[PDB]
Amino acid sequence: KCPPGTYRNTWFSGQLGSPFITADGVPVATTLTELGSGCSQCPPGTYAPTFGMSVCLPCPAGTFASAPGATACQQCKPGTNSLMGDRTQQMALVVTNAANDFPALRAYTISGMVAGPAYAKPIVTGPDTNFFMAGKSETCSTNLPGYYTDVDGLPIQLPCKPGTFMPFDTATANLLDTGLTVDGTQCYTCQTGTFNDEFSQPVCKACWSGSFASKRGLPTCEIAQPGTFTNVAAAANATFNT
Amino acid sequence: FNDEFSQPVCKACWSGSFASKRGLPTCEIAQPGTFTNVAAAANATFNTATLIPTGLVKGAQAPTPCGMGYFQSSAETTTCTACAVGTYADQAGLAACKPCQPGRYQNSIGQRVCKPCDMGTYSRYGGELCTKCPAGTVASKTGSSQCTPCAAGFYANAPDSATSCRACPRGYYGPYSGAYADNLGDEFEGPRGC
Numbered sequence: 182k183c184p185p186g187t188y189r190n191t192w193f194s195g196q197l198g199s200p201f202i203t204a205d206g207v208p209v210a211t212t213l214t215e216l217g218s219g220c221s222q223c224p225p226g227t228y229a230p231t232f233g234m235s236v237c238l239p240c241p242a243g244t245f246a247s248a249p250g251a252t253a254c255q256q257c258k259p260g261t262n263s264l265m266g267d268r269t270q271q272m273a274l275v276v277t278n279a280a281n282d283f284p285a286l287r288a289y290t291i292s293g294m295v296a297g298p299a300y301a302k303p304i305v306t307g308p309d310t311n312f313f314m315a316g317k318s319e320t321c322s323t324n325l326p327g328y329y330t331d332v333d334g335l336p337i338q339l340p341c342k343p344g345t346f347m348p349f350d351t352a353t354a355n356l357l358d359t360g361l362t363v364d365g366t367q368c369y370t371c372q373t374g375t376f377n378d379e380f381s382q383p384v385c386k387a388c389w390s391g392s393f394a395s396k397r398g399l400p401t402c403e404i405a406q407p408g409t410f411t412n413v414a415a416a417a418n419a420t421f422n423t
Numbered sequence: 424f425n426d427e428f429s430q431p432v433c434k435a436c437w438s439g440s441f442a443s444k445r446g447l448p449t450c451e452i453a454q455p456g457t458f459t460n461v462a463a464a465a466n467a468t469f470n471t472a473t474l475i476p477t478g479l480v481k482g483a484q485a486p487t488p489c490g491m492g493y494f495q496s497s498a499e500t501t502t503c504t505a506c507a508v509g510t511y512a513d514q515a516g517l518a519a520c521k522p523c524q525p526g527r528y529q530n531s532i533g534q535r536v537c538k539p540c541d542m543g544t545y546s547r548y549g550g551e552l553c554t555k556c557p558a559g560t561v562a563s564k565t566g567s568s569q570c571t572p573c574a575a576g577f578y579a580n581a582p583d584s585a586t587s588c589r590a591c592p593r594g595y596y597g598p599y600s601g602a603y604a605d606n607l608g609d610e611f612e613g614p615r616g617c
């Protein structure tokens with residue numbers, strides 16, 4: 182039997198490398214084989230745990246293999262997921278290689294206010310294609326804005342509950358306290374005077390004039406009671422750079 | 424806040440309560456899962472010579488929800504304790520943090536996550552540690568709620584905390600279910616094994 186981490190099959194062999202680590206976007210094919218035996222080494226993203234198997238088992242969602250021949254793949258660290266491409270690619274919209282639209286992996290679509298008074302839902306439309314979570318052939322991607330992974334090995338990044346938000350980065354976090362930093366494993370409550378009622382929001386929502394939010398992480402704004410009022414001109418939602 | 428008629432100065436809300444609105448007749452206490460404390464919160468002292476109040480320092484304005492890994496069961500409080508071992512608080516401002524779901528465990532204080540049980544072990548709700556699955560039963564997957572008995576004609580691979588069930592080999596037979604191998608003697612037989 183072939184040693185673990187390798188596979189022998191009549192109809193195919195070799196390794197198909199990770200396409201998301203190459204600027205071209207075309208997966209480079211190699212022929213790495215075990216020295217003594219001769220069986221082809223298991224391709225990246227897949228692991229061969231047992232003795233003498235024909236094909237390579239793709240890694241389960243929430244796990245990643247990055248080297249040819251694994252016998253097992255480790256779990257994604259907390260704050261990271263198992264999605265095709267890194268965080269930049271799956272959040273990108275422009276194209277570099279016109280042959281195959283690389284790396285416009287339009288996988289992150291969030292519905293919110295856009296440039297101009299218009300409110301688009303979702304801001305990115307179309308049939309989503311790059312959604313695979315099993316074969317993570319490269320280093321784990323960072324979680325998209327609005328999602329978190331507290332415990333390592335989670336299959337899918339979970340969304341932030343209403344009343345909490347998660348920004349893209351500390352530098353770009355528009356309304357976040359000075360001492361708090363984001364990494365991918367935390368869900369911060371909405372700032373007092375703001376609210377949020379939708380799962381997986383990268384920013385809290387300003388409470389409209391005539392209402393108020395007197396508590397941290399309020400799922401819904403509070404209507405001003407009779408005899409009282411609130412009006413702040415500067416209050417406005419956060420617009421999304423398309 | 425203030426509740427007495429004709430006062431020359433308001434009174435700061437004590438630690439464990441807040442006044443979120445102007446002109447509050449009575450300070451409102453902090454609800455469970457939240458705490459308020461301001462050590463600098465004075466109430467004015469009257470200068471006996473001139474009957475002038477001074478020294479008032481405003482108290483808490485809004486409740487502070489308890490951070491991740493902390494819970495607060497009671498109201499009127501000034502701080503919240505780390506969650507008891509075997510339980511976790513994965514949110515902010517929790518009345519009483521939930522116990523770890525079956526198949527998980529948490530052997531630490533103040534954690535916001537439950538670690539998953541390793542292979543060959545199981546755990547019900549809560550759980551100090553992953554229970555080593557008893558003899559004759561097997562838990563082949565990590566985070567198993569319970570470990571099932573080995574089928575008749577099969578035997579557990581280990582005397583304690585079995586990870587797989589194997590068929591009795593050629594020339595052997597397992598009459599009872601829940602058979603398990605034993606290290607002592609031959610490795611293919613047990614007290615009820617093959």
Ligand SMILES: *[C@@H]1O[C@H](CO)[C@@H](O[C@@H]2O[C@H](CO)[C@@H](O)[C@H](O)[C@H]2NC(C)=O)[C@H](O)[C@H]1NC(C)=O
Nearest residue numbers: 378386387388389390401402415416417418419
């Ligand atoms: C931020 O966006 C939210 C969500 O669209 C707005 O909240 C709505 O406000 C209207 C009045 O303008 C209310 O009638 C709706 O009930 C609110 N919706 C929800 C879901 O709460 C909010 O007004 C926006 N903030 C500002 C400052 O414009």
Ligand SMILES: *[C@@H]1O[C@H](CO)[C@@H](O[C@@H]2O[C@H](CO)[C@@H](O)[C@H](O)[C@H]2NC(C)=O)[C@H](O)[C@H]1NC(C)=O
Nearest residue numbers: 426434435436437438449450464465466467482
């Ligand atoms: C300011 O002094 C007043 C006394 O005039 C305090 O009022 C009481 O405070 C205790 C806690 O120390 C509460 O149990 C009572 O319910 C309060 N009375 C009322 C009528 O509300 C007030 O707490 C003092 N402030 C501080 C910060 O000690």
